[PDB]
Write an enzyme that holds these catalytic residues in place. Structure first.
Site, PDB file in Angstrom:
ATOM      1  N   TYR A  93      40.467  32.736  41.266  1.00  0.00           N
ATOM      2  CA  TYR A  93      40.133  33.978  41.620  1.00  0.00           C
ATOM      3  C   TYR A  93      39.712  34.191  43.145  1.00  0.00           C
ATOM      4  CZ  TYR A  93      40.866  35.148  36.593  1.00  0.00           C
ATOM      5  OH  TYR A  93      41.217  35.149  35.310  1.00  0.00           O
ATOM      6  N   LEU A  95      40.106  34.793  46.885  1.00  0.00           N
ATOM      7  CA  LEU A  95      41.135  35.546  47.503  1.00  0.00           C
ATOM      8  C   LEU A  95      41.109  34.981  49.095  1.00  0.00           C
ATOM      9  CD1 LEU A  95      39.214  38.964  46.795  1.00  0.00           C
ATOM     10  CD2 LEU A  95      41.337  38.383  46.497  1.00  0.00           C
ATOM     11  N   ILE A 100      35.536  36.103  46.558  1.00  0.00           N
ATOM     12  CA  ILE A 100      36.006  35.940  45.212  1.00  0.00           C
ATOM     13  C   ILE A 100      36.099  37.315  44.252  1.00  0.00           C
ATOM     14  CG2 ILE A 100      35.092  34.789  43.135  1.00  0.00           C
ATOM     15  CD1 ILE A 100      32.970  33.517  44.813  1.00  0.00           C
ATOM     16  N   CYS A 101      37.310  37.211  43.687  1.00  0.00           N
ATOM     17  CA  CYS A 101      37.696  38.487  42.897  1.00  0.00           C
ATOM     18  C   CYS A 101      37.115  38.340  41.506  1.00  0.00           C
ATOM     19  CB  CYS A 101      39.211  38.439  42.601  1.00  0.00           C
ATOM     20  SG  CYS A 101      39.884  40.071  41.991  1.00  0.00           S
ATOM     21  N   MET A 102      35.736  38.388  41.480  1.00  0.00           N
ATOM     22  CA  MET A 102      34.966  38.172  40.282  1.00  0.00           C
ATOM     23  C   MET A 102      34.323  39.367  39.953  1.00  0.00           C
ATOM     24  SD  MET A 102      32.280  34.992  39.739  1.00  0.00           S
ATOM     25  CE  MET A 102      30.953  35.687  40.516  1.00  0.00           C
TER      26      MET A 102
END
Length: 156
Positions: A93, A95, A100-102
């Site tokens: 996750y 990017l 962070i694509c959290m």
């Protein structure tokens, strides 16, 4: 602010007395003595990433995922700005740039109740769940705060 400052000191004091931090799972380093700028390195990551870190210590540098927590953007009202400093990773996750694509790192999944002790672990988990791997090719310059901001920017 006195509240943001006190809250932050409480967190670090928690992390210090947590079995997570005692077991060597990670570390917390106030970059430039700054109470608002944390370098959280994951030392103990049974997974593919766990593998890539073994041959990380030997081949190039040490063995840890270096995170950067920036607490200037209205924390705890807004999430801490977290990014991956190194090493360069695929998946997990992460990017372009190290953002962070959290979930919890969004203004729709974050809670002032969440602990920094926990968001660190959720990152350690999110990275594993997303089957993150070390891009042994790219140089660390691939990950910059600059590249992390504009990336996270588009995300929103």
């Amino acid at each position: 602010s006195v509240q943001a400052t006190d809250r932050l000191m409480k967190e670090l004091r928690d992390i210090y007395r947590s079995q997570s931090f005692k077991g060597g799972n990670y570390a917390v380093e106030l970059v430039n003595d700054s109470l608002y700028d944390w370098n959280v390195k994951l030392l103990k990551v049974d997974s593919a990433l766990h593998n890539d870190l073994q041959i990380l210590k030997e081949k190039e540098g040490a063995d840890f995922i270096l995170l950067n927590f920036s607490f200037k953007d209205n924390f705890p009202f807004d999430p801490p700005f977290v990014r991956v400093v190194s090493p360069v990773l695929s998946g997990g996750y992460v990017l372009g740039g190290g953002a962070i694509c959290m979930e919890l790192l969004t203004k729709q999944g974050w809670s002032s109740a969440y602990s920094i002790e926990s968001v660190i672990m959720q990152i350690s988990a999110t990275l594993v769940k997303g089957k993150a791997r070390v891009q042994f090719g790219a140089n660390k310059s691939q990950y910059s705060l600059t590249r992390a901001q504009q990336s996270y920017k588009s995300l929103v």
